[PDB]
Design a protein around this nucleic acid. Structure first.
Ligand SMILES: [Mg+2]
Ligand SMILES: [Zn+2]
Ligand SMILES: [Zn+2]
Lengths: 57, 1111, 111, 170, 94, 147, 8, 56, 222
DNA sequence: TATAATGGGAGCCTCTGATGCA
DNA sequence: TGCATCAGAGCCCAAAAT
């Protein structure tokens, strides 16, 4: 039952959430990358707040 | 030629300016021509006044001004620019402490300008802002669906300008108020407004059982401060009930004109419904430190009175056009303007904290980017901002008059049921009952009626003539639906001698209900039958004889008519086709009286009374949004005396100033060897020979050359590995020359791109070594003609970087545009239609000798199958054909108005005069009746068509009065065994043409993630074989056909490669492999933390990733 | 062997880590100047595989004679680029997080 | 989405036999293109497949023997015609194509009812079954002439209607 | 309608088995270059070119005609697959 | 359908109603591992009950259950089938907890996998059918005689 | 239910 | 007179008795002649072809 | 030989109500509420309507158009549900061996006469045609054997037998009673209705059922 | 890296199934 | 135990999208 709680969160392969240069040299990218980025930022910040002994709030 | 017009109805007023719904709305919004001190608080002005003053230092609004457009309209379309004006605002920054005042005029960016015809130019493309129908703000009482003897009171303000409030009498008896999904007893809110039990008991006591449900002792115990804090804790749980915080929230919810706006229409409807007068657009006020009520007590009084059944209290019909209003261009744009302004204001307050609190100007305080963005977003990406339909001039005129219930602030398509889509009785004279889309949007997209106009409040009004005594005045009163319901209105065709009603009983409407009435009871009378229908619908002759379902298609299809090089106005018109060309702005007219000085293909110079010499340049072969050619032709000659309003040039699809959407062709109604089957149409090659139904089309092609990390793209004539045969028509610079004929595969603009760094495969190493030729650094990226396209090159535009007047988007060295034109003859698969909803695709083009023909040798043009008529019940096309026959021999055209038209006797009369020309001529020329004409006459008297005993001439005339003639089969020479209906019909070539739709693909582009073929003809796409197509293959049991669709012909990469290689080698196609999108699905489920495992019969893992994804 | 069955099951943190070819430690995507992927970011070639067939990132080992080699300098395996559609990464959370399907799908399975 | 597919406007083809359709030649050249490349090699039209493809790329380089080669390529083969919505299995039927000048697909009158097709501007999609197995399935199971009775009612589906009824009645 | 389709449906318990037999036979003909055919020179399906009559290239047309002759034997478990494949390549190489 | 003049064979409607009646609810578990109120396919409890009644055990008492086409479709044994229908997260969480194995019995499962469906020419009944010509047939026969 | 409101 | 119903029955009966191939042949024949006669028959629609009964 | 009459009579085009609107009167029209106007349209399309008649008529046209539009989605969804529930049902064997069957009634109890009367032809044909007989049936001196696929002739015989008081219901193999797992069997299914002959093992019968029920969906009411 | 600064902001259908109250 | 209330689940296809 504890597998329903995640410790390691999987990261989908990049070609399935691509960052591609379109015709004009502009970049177009899948929304998952922004969702992963939100996740990573908050996780890293959590590691840092923990290391610095932040208050419980 | 002669034009004989029928009908006795005299319409006292002409049609209004047809685009006024657009033009006037926007004029009012910008108030550009009003000097600032004289502006009303409306539109852009009202938005500024709402946003300012920005309190926090205080920044105040003085006035705004609009500059001139940096570039004219033609230039904007050329350069892909928006036609717009610079917006400035004089703002003064004040320090309330010091008194210091710095005042400055800040530049807010640009605002788009409407052209003369009511459209916009946004990034080079013409756009239309479609009006949006919606619920009028106000106070409504609707029945409660759950509890029959109860009602719901809804207080509705303008969109985004406040919450809706719902008043209900709960089963427990206490009157509840619902705001932002929370409910509470209304008694609490009444106490905050300062009401006491004494005032409320005496006021509402008359309605017995309800007032006691309002009485709550605990609420009256607490003073207005305690009741206000109590309400704030109910509405915003968890937010600390600071007394200043509660006042602020409740003020913002009720009395704040910035956060709460009832309409001006909202105010009038409330005042009219509840019988009070509002000091403003808010439900209450904040005055002398407390809240003072305006609306709540009157709605509560009416609500109880309705539940109790007090006379004079009604529920509201919410689909009535008194309760439904239009939001036009000005209002929609102003709304987004108000939004951008609020964002800009947020930035101001945020800038009024930071920086130096001492040295600040308005230029330092204001960032206009939020405003520019809000407007830019509305015009480009809004749903109500649509690519203009300019297939033909009538297309855009109709587009400007459309009404949508969709869009921001409106209905979704699934959430829209029957009630909204219905033709309400109040649509009469306001919204056309006919012109609406077939399909999912039916009843949601509608069209403004011809005589209808939108008032300042946004309600559609329609004209009626006053009738006093029995006398019909010429004074017309424009009425809303609500005011129309008061009177008894006679039909427009009721007989008149002079101004007096000549009938003992008249046909009228009272609240839409038809009734027979005395001339003494007649208060008003319709202006015309034209007022019930849209402009497109008003263009259908004999509309009274057509079932509405086909008239719908007839209306809509005129929109799709292609401008023809030979276009003609119909021989049977309705009398609106001149006005449509004039309001369309396609045709060119003379300003004042004068004499024509010069006439050219390119220009017309006119010398007026003033002596001033005016030159009119003509738009020649310009490409519309849909690629039809807009081109103007001079209709006057050097030295011609013209009056004011005389035609100078014909626009597209007009003939001598009359709307020309098609051609007048000779039609025979008869089956023909099944080429007529199930709406297909047979046409004569003579139509192509004489260039009927030929249309010019222009396609625009574009290519960019940009900087890369690998080196420059270059537009050049030097392209690797191409023969001189391939480069023949390219100039020195690599652009195809004007006048060249280009076919699919041909280079339009030559271009090279630097090869992405790659190591040549050992095969290429060996190949290069064998032939001794260096692999070039650059690759051929040239723009070529796509499959199925091509024509003559009529224009090229080249824009480089670093040349005067032009700056491209970052990285782009140069841009080339090639305009390719084509003269399109009518062909098999092209779609024809008449104005009655008869539509069909051309299935056969016969040589002239096979065409059925008249005794005198004339072949018919088109053969239409009679099987299309009886189920469709559009008989107007038949009457059009009969009258068209008379006109063919008499050499005349007719104007038959809608519902007051040419009737059968009159058409017979013309047919008799026509028969004299068709026959009497022959008898003088020394020919008698034909043997085969006798045989047809024999079968005809067996049919009861002709009277027995009459002469052959007399019988032929009897048939001709029925619109039937003797017809010879061009193949045999023998007659058709019965007399056949033949005449002139007006038929249009629609915008759906096989040249555009034909597509095929072997292999081609695949999608990034799925590796499935792309979609659409423009992408070289594959057809979608969808869920339902798979069911079909499944029901056939075609397992291998289906498996091919799912693997080798789609995303099976190994499989599709192997299949191609096998076919070019003559081998049979190999067994398919795993579709790549299944691998995507597995990996997507792994990303969701689910383990998906393919297993064999032994339940052991099977690796469909072939070891590549496992360590 | 032939596929006769498809099983779907919950994935342990161990299994998720066995799938993973690396941990994505940074929100970075690709370098704004070089346009190559940023190390330890979402597109990293050391984790999800090479962008180009049988060619490492820095370009020391460019052909199939090395297949399975991992460039000491650039850290990329030399294999087919197709693997960027297949190889999974992972994020190591500082606090466990519930998988919402097992929370919000009523009646909740965890609940 | 699938390869070896196309779409066009449909037009009535009274002269067709029940197992036939009119297929525009320019569509057929693309749909069968790989087959055509092979056939263009057997006959001498091109040295090899690479040269053959390059010759078909430019429309002005296409000569008259390739049209004859394409007739040979498609010989005895059928294609699938589909019209949306595909409500039942007769929304797809197989026909032996008869190459035509012109850009319209020609549809046999008797199948219009099952497809709910008419000539007011309807379009249909074409598909090429590739393998011998797929082609066998199409010719045996899916061919229009082999499906004459409704799988729903058992009554005739392909039957006289409109003009046909009219002549016979008269 | 395919020539003799009613008789072809007569020969099988399930219309789908006819399709399997036709398809497999056509694959045999293609693989072995038609030289394993059971037809006689005058029974060969023909195709009219600009030159004149040539052999029908279509293996599915061929296979159905062959079936109608009666000279083909079809069923399940008639012979091991490898043995069939090797015996056909011995009699008619590629 | 009759009122609209649509001739349609009862046979087809019967196929659907049959799928509507596919499931039963356990009234008493008997000697089995099943629970009271547990829902399962009618086939499986009939099979279980003949294994129990032939084993000398008290059979499961069950009740007929009627469910609409949507619920029945969502309840089918195949999780690829059910999850591609609708209610994808619900279907997928219950399937993943249970460790469900899709046996690829129906059409949708094989279509998703790009497999050859179990119908028509893909039916196991006609799929393995061999063709051989009389010359090769006798040739093979003589080869088998010489061993 | 509202993470901002809760934190506040 | 042959009409929709009689002609539908004919096709069905032909299918039972003669089979697909012949019924396919029969349908094309019915198609051919039906079309042929319909064009020469002199079927048309004029406004006088909608005949108002005196009884109205 | 009038063209309208001939087209209508032959079934080439037209029906009586459409002809009535052309040569007759248009008739009663309904308000948006569904309530009928008291005054009818006395005009026919040949005579031509009055703007008021035309306007009164638009309400029903529009209501019809909206009906139609909202129906194609509802039917489509229905069809997709049907497909998802029947897709696995395939004819997987020749005989499941069941002894169970269903008895198709030839008589419906009439409430108004409160006695049995004969079911309509088409109704009986839809329940009988192409079915295998479950039990032996002897009527009118004919033996319809157990296991016989009923030809349309066989059905007409049973109808004639029922009119002669010989048989009130017919025992028949049906998918309701079939014991085949994951599908039906040849006998319980019957005719492949498109071939007028026993269904072939392997026919995807479930899909065909969903397509057969779903295709007319847009023709019902809303 | 230093005057003091201390709680946000937008908001508008039908059926089915579980859950929280008589 | 029997009944409202609410949260969450769905709502045709293909074409096209300028
Ligand atoms: Mg159509
Ligand atoms: Zn490296
Ligand atoms: Zn059975």
């Amino acid at each position: 039952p504890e597998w329903m709680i995640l410790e390691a969160v999987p990261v989908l392969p990049p070609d399935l959430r691509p960052m591609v240069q379109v015709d004009g040299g502009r970049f177009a990218t899948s929304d998952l990358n922004d969702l992963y980025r939100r996740l990573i930022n908050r996780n890293n910040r959590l590691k840092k707040l923990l290391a610095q002994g932040a208050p419980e709030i | 030629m002669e034009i004989k017009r029928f009908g006795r109805i005299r319409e006292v007023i002409p049609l209004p300016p047809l685009t006024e719904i657009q033009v006037e709305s926007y004029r009012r919004a910008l108030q550009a021509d009003v000097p600032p001190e004289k502006r009303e608080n409306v539109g852009i002005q009202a938005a500024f006044r709402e946003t300012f003053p920005i309190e926090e230092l205080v920044l105040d609004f003085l006035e705004y001004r609009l500059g001139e457009p940096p570039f004219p309209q033609d230039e904007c379309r050329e350069k892909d620019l928006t036609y717009q004006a610079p917006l400035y605002a004089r703002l003064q920054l004040i320090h309330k402490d010091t008194g210091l005042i710095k005042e400055d005029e800040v530049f807010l960016g640009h605002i788009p300008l409407m052209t003369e015809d009511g459209s916009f130019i946004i990034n080079g493309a013409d756009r239309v802002i479609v009006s949006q129908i919606h619920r009028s703000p106000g106070v409504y009482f609707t029945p409660d669906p759950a509890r029959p003897g109860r009602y719901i009171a809804s207080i509705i303000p303008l969109p985004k300008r406040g919450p809706w409030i719902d008043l209900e009498v709960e089963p427990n008896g206490v009157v509840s108020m619902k705001v932002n999904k929370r409910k509470f007893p209304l008694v609490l809110l009444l106490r905050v407004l300062g009401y006491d039990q004494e005032t409320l008991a005496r006021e509402l006591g008359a309605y017995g059982e309800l007032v006691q449900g309002l009485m709550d002792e605990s609420v009256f115990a607490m003073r207005p401060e305690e009741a206000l804090i109590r309400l704030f804790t109910l509405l915003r749980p968890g937010d600390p009930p600071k007394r200043d915080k509660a006042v602020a929230y409740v003020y913002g919810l009720i009395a704040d004109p910035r956060r709460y706006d009832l309409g001006e229409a909202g105010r009038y409807k409330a005042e009219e419904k509840l019988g009070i007068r509002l000091s403003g657009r808010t439900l209450a006020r904040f005055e002398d430190g407390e809240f003072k009520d305006e609306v709540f007590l009157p709605t509560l009084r009416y609500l109880f009175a309705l539940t109790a059944g007090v006379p004079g209290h009604e529920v509201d019909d919410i689909d009535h056009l008194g309760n439904r209003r239009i939001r036009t261009v000005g209002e929609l744009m102003t709304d987004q303007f108000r939004v951008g302004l609020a964002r800009l204001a947020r930035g101001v307050r945020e800038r009024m904290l930071m920086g130096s609190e001492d040295s600040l100007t308005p230029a330092k305080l204001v960032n206009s980017r939020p405003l520019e963005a809000a407007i830019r977003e509305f015009f480009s990406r809004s749903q109500l901002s649509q690519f203009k339909d300019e297939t033909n001039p009538l297309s855009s005129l109709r587009h400007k008059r459309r009404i949508s219930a969709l869009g921001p602030g409106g209905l979704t398509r699934e959430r829209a049921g029957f009630d909204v889509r219905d033709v309400h009785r109040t649509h009469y004279g306001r919204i056309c009952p006919v012109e609406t889309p077939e399909g999912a949007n039916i009843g949601l997209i509608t069209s403004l009626a011809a005589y209808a106009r939108v008032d300042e409040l946004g309600f559609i009004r329609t004209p009626y003539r006053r009738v006093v005594g029995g006398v019909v005045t010429d004074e017309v009163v424009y009425m809303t639906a609500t005011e129309e319901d008061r009177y008894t209105i006679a039909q427009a065709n009721t007989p008149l001698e002079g101004n007096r009603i000549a009938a003992e009983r008249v046909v009228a409407r009272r609240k839409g209900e038809p009734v027979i009435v005395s001339p003494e009871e007649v208060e008003f009378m319709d202006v015309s039958p034209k007022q019930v229908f849209s402009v497109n619908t008003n263009l259908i002759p004999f509309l009274e004889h057509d079932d509405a379902n086909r008239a719908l298609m007839g209306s809509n299809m005129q929109t799709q008519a292609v401008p023809l090089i030979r276009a003609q106005a119909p021989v049977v018109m309705t009398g609106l086709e001149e006005r449509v060309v004039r309001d369309s702005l396609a045709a060119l007219y003379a300003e004042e009286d004068g004499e024509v000085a010069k006439v050219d293909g390119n220009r017309i110079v006119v010398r007026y009374e003033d002596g001033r010499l005016v030159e009119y340049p003509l738009r020649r072969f310009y490409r519309s949004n849909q690629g039809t050619a807009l081109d103007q032709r001079p209709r006057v000659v050097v030295g011609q005396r013209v009056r004011k309003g005389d035609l100078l040039a014909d626009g597209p699809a007009s003939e001598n100033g009359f709307l020309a959407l098609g051609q007048n062709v000779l039609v025979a109604i008869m089956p023909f060897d099944g080429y007529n089957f199930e709406d297909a149409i047979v046409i004569s090659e003579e139509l192509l020979k004489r260039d009927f139904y030929t249309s010019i089309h222009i396609e625009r092609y574009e290519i960019e050359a940009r900087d890369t990390k690998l080196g420059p793209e270059r537009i050049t004539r030097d392209i690797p590995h191409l023969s001189e045969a391939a480069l023949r028509d390219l100039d020195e610079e690599g652009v195809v020359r004007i006048g060249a004929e280009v076919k699919p595969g041909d280079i339009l603009v030559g271009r090279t791109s630097f090869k992405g760094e790659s190591e040549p495969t050992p095969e290429e190493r060996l190949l290069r070594s064998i032939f001794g030729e260096k692999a070039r650094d650059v690759k051929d990226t040239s723009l070529r003609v796509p499959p199925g396209e091509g024509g003559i090159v009529v224009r090229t535009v080249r824009l480089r970087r670093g040349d005067p007047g032009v700056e491209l988007k970052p990285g782009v060295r140069e841009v080339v545009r090639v305009y390719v034109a084509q003269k399109r003859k009518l062909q098999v698969g092209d779609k024809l239609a008449n104005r009655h909803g008869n539509k069909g695709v051309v299935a056969k083009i016969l040589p002239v000798e096979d065409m059925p023909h008249l005794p005198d040798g004339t072949p018919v043009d088109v053969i239409l199958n009679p099987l299309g008529v009886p189920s469709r019940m559009n008989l107007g096309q038949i009457l059009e054909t009969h009258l068209g026959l008379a006109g063919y021999f008499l050499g005349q055209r007719y104007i038959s108005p809608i519902f007051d038209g040419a009737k059968e006797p009159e058409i017979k009369e013309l047919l008799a005069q026509a028969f004299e020309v068709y026959f009497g001529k022959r008898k003088g020329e020394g020919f008698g009746v034909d043997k085969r004409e006798v045989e047809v006459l024999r079968r005809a008297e067996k049919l009861g068509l002709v009277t027995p005993g009459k002469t052959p001439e007399e019988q032929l005339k009897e048939l001709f009065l029925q619109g039937k003639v003797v017809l010879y089969d061009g193949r045999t020479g023998e007659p058709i065994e019965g007399p056949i209906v033949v005449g002139q019909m007006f038929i249009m070539k629609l915008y759906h043409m096989v040249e555009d739709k034909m597509h095929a693909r072997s292999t081609g582009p695949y999608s990034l993630i799925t590796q499935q073929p792309l979609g659409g003809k423009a992408q070289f796409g594959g057809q979608r074989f969808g869920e339902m197509e798979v069911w079909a293959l499944e029901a056939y049991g075609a397992a291998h056909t289906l498996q091919e669709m799912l693997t080798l012909k789609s995303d099976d990469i190994e499989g599709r490669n192997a299949a191609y290689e096998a076919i070019i080698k003559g081998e049979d196609v190999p067994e398919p492999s795993v579709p790549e999108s299944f691998r995507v699905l597995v990996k997507e489920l792994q990303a969701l933390a689910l383990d998906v495992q393919t297993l064999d019969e032994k339940d052991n893992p099977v690796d469909i990733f072939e070891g590549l994804a496992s360590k | 062997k032939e596929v006769r069955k498809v099983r779907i099951a919950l994935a342990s943190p161990e299994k998720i880590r066995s799938w993973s070819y690396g941990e994505v430690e940074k929100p970075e995507t690709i370098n704004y100047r070089t346009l190559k992927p940023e190390r330890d970011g979402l597109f990293d070639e050391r984790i999800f595989g090479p962008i180009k067939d049988y060619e490492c990132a820095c370009g020391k080992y460019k052909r199939q004679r090395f297949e399975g080699k991992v460039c000491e300098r650039c850290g990329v395996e030399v294999t087919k680029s197709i693997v960027r559609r297949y190889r999974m990464g992972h994020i190591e959370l500082a606090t466990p997080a519930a998988h919402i399907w097992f929370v919000k799908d009523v009646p909740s399975k965890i609940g | 989405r699938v390869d070896y597919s196309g779409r066009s406007v449909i037009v009535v083809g009274p002269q067709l036999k029940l197992h036939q359709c009119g297929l525009p030649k320019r569509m057929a050249l693309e749909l069968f293109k790989p087959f055509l490349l092979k056939k263009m090699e057997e006959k001498g039209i091109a040295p090899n497949v690479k040269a053959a493809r390059r010759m078909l790329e430019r429309q002005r380089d296409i000569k008259d023997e390739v049209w004859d080669a394409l007739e040979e390529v498609i010989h005895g083969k059928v294609v699938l015609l589909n019209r949306a919505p595909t409500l039942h299995r007769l929304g797809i039927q197989a026909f032996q194509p008869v190459l035509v000048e012109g850009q319209s697909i020609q549809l046999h009158p008797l199948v219009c009812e099952a497809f709910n097709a008419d000539f007011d501007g309807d379009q249909m999609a074409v598909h090429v079954p590739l393998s011998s197995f797929a082609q066998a399935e199409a010719r045996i199971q899916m061919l229009s002439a082999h499906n004459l009775l409704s799988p729903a009612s058992g009554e005739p589906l392909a039957k006289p209607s409109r003009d046909i009824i009219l002549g016979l009645y008269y | 309608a395919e020539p003799g389709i009613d008789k072809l449906f007569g020969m099988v318990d399930s219309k789908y088995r006819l399709t399997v037999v036709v398809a497999k036979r056509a694959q045999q003909l293609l693989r072995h270059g038609f030289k394993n055919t059971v037809l006689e020179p005058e029974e060969r399906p023909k195709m009219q070119t600009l030159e004149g009559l040539f052999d029908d290239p279509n293996a599915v047309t061929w296979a159905m005609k062959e079936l109608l002759t009666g000279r083909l034997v079809f069923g399940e478990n008639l012979v091991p697959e490898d043995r069939l494949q090797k015996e056909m390549e011995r009699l008619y190489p590629v | 359908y009759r009122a609209q003049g649509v001739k349609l064979h009862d046979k087809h409607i019967e196929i659907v109603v049959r799928q509507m009646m596919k499931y039963v609810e356990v009234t008493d578990p008997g000697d089995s591992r099943l629970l009271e109120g547990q829902v399962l396919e009618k086939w499986d409890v009939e099979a279980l009950n003949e294994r129990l009644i032939a084993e000398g055990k008290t059979p499961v008492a069950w009740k007929p259950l009627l469910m609409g086409v949507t619920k029945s479709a969502l309840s089918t044994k195949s999780w690829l089938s059910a999850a591609s229908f609708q209610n994808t997260t619900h279907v997928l969480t219950e399937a993943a907890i249970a460790g469900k194995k899709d046996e690829l019995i129906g059409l949708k499962e094989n279509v998703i996998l790009g497999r050859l469906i179990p119908a028509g020419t893909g039916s196991d009944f006609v799929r393995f059918t061999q063709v051989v010509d009389q010359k090769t047939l006798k040739a093979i026969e003589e080869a088998r005689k010489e061993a | 239910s509202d993470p901002v409101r809760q934190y506040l | 007179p042959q009409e929709k119903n009689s002609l539908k029955d004919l096709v069905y009966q032909a299918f039972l008795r003669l089979g697909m191939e012949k019924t396919a042949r029969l349908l094309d024949a019915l198609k051919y002649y039906g079309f042929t006669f319909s064009t020469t028959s002199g079927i048309t629609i004029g406004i006088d072809d909608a005949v108002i009964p005196e009884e109205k | 030989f009038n063209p309208l009459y001939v087209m209508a009579q032959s079934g080439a085009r037209g029906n009586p109500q459409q002809i009535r609107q052309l040569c007759g009167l248009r008739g009663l029209m309904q308000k948006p509420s569904g309530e009928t106007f008291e005054v009818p349209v006395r005009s026919s399309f040949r005579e031509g309507l009055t703007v008021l008649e035309y306007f009164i008529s638009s309400h029903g046209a529009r209501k019809g158009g909206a009906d139609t539009a909202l129906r194609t989605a509802d039917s489509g969804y229905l069809t997709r549900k049907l497909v998802d529930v029947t897709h696995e049902i395939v004819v997987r064997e020749a005989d499941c061996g069941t002894t169970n069957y269903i008895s198709v009634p030839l008589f419906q109890p009439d409430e108004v006469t409160r006695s049995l009367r004969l079911r309509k032809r088409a109704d009986i044909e839809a329940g009988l045609y192409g079915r295998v007989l479950a039990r032996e049936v002897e009527v009118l001196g004919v033996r319809l054997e157990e296991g016989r696929y009923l030809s349309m002739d066989d059905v007409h015989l049973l109808i004639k037998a029922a009119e002669a008081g010989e048989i009130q219901e017919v025992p028949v193999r049906s998918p309701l009673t079939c014991q085949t797992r994951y599908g039906v069997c040849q006998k319980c299914y019957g005719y492949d209705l498109s071939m007028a002959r026993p269904v072939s093992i392997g026919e995807a019968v479930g899909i065909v059922a969903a397509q057969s029920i779903g295709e007319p969906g847009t023709q019902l009411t809303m």
